[PDB]
Symmetry: C2
Subunit: 262 residues, 2 copies
């Protein structure tokens, strides 16, 4: 009885509202003016200005709902979570926070932001890695992160535009250190990250070799928001295996119709 749950972040701003959503909710003075009910009542102050959101978008209001539902589902299934890690993307942090709410654990449990959980650095448009909000600015922004946590791969140890199996490796490496620094200290582990993280984090843990970098991207655009899978360790023999999740899947469609009229 030990469990690793790995799930993807919830619905993301720049996908619904697309690349330039920033011009849709920030005026010239830098004030946030929501223009759609799927946009949160407020966004966190990024110490570098509203421009930093460009390479690190937040989740939408329905993004929170997805995550809440997952947390509540988890609580209904009496599934206890002991440690919760997430990627440093804001979207991931926010999804972890909101899972903790549904779980009714946001001010008992504390998210461990692990830059090693971040997605394959190829998908970072730009020459330069996102300006992530450091943990302590994140707590200050009402997210339940652990400022005490010392990362396994800190930011500076991340190569921009890195090799595919570099990404695969760090996933296996990070997940490995996570599983063991949580061993003496209670059962179930939750990781909140990216589409790629579902495969990458678990794959070699079950002794299976990764798909080469082409069939991968295929399987990555497969994964839904709050897409969720789980692993179980037999004995403490160190061998993990795939497992039916402890909660129902979550499917829903779009508001639909016309994105635009008149």
């Amino acid at each position: 009885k030990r469990c690793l749950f790995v799930c993807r972040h919830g619905e993301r701003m720049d996908v619904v509202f697309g690349k330039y959503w920033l011009s849709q909710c920030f005026d010239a003075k830098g004030r946030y003016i929501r223009t759609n009910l799927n946009m949160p009542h407020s966004l966190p102050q990024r110490s570098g200005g509203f421009r930093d959101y460009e390479k690190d978008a937040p989740i939408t209001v329905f993004g929170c709902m997805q995550a809440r539902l997952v947390g509540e589902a988890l609580l209904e299934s009496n599934t206890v979570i002991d440690h919760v890690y997430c990627s440093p993307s804001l979207r991931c942090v926010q999804t972890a926070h909101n899972i903790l709410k549904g779980l009714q654990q946001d001010n008992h449990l504390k998210i461990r932001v692990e830059p090693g959980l971040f997605e394959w650095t190829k998908w970072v448009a730009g020459s330069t890695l996102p300006a992530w909000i450091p943990p302590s600015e994140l707590a200050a922004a009402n997210l339940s992160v652990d400022t005490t946590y010392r990362p396994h791969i800190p930011v500076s140890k991340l190569a921009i535009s890195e090799s595919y199996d570099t990404y695969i490796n760090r996933s296996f490496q990070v997940t490995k250190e996570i599983i063991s620094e949580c061993k003496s200290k209670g059962n179930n582990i939750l990781i909140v990250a990216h589409a790629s993280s579902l495969e990458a984090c678990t794959c070699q843990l079950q002794g299976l070799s990764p798909q080469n970098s082409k069939d991968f991207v295929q399987m990555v655009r497969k994964i839904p928001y709050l897409g969720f899978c789980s692993c179980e360790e037999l004995g403490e023999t160190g061998i993990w295996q795939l497992t039916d999740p402890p909660i129902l899947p979550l499917t829903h469609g779009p508001t639909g119709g016309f994105n635009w009229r008149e």
Copy 2:
């Protein structure tokens, strides 16, 4: 200052989970077993059995969210609603109920189920009209309907597989009776219905003639869930006009 707001129901079971969703959440004994987080924790007992849902699907959990958000939006904009009507489809009733929650009005205000607000009866698959839940069974199911309400077009006055401009007419007729039975009795009216209802209910109210039955269906698959539009009456001269809604639009994508 009088307003008619007309909006479409929220996300619907049989579209997300498709035609046979019933076999996905009811076992042989007729017990509901949800198989997805977008499925409500429970469904209302239909006096005819779980089979009645087939021609009258409920809204999904994200269906409720959409509606709630609209209600809350309405409250934030300090927009007061005085009368709320809906189509008899369960999906419409449920959307109205959930708007009233966001609005914080569910046990002050009472939904008036109006069979005249129902969609063009062509889109009823089957030889026979849906087995709608009558108002009093609906209250009994925790929806804030008015059992006192006497409908303008009751169920029996609805033709199955009816004519297009029959549908257009009843829309104009029903909306007309709604606007006037609410006149002496306070300002804003909310109708919760169908995609077709947005055009059909308002169109001739502004003196515009309807699109013929081909360009219509085009404009009907246009309209989003909780799609929302509004009308304003100038003076009490009886002339209505199009107006910017009092609340932001709601757009979101799929889980994918």
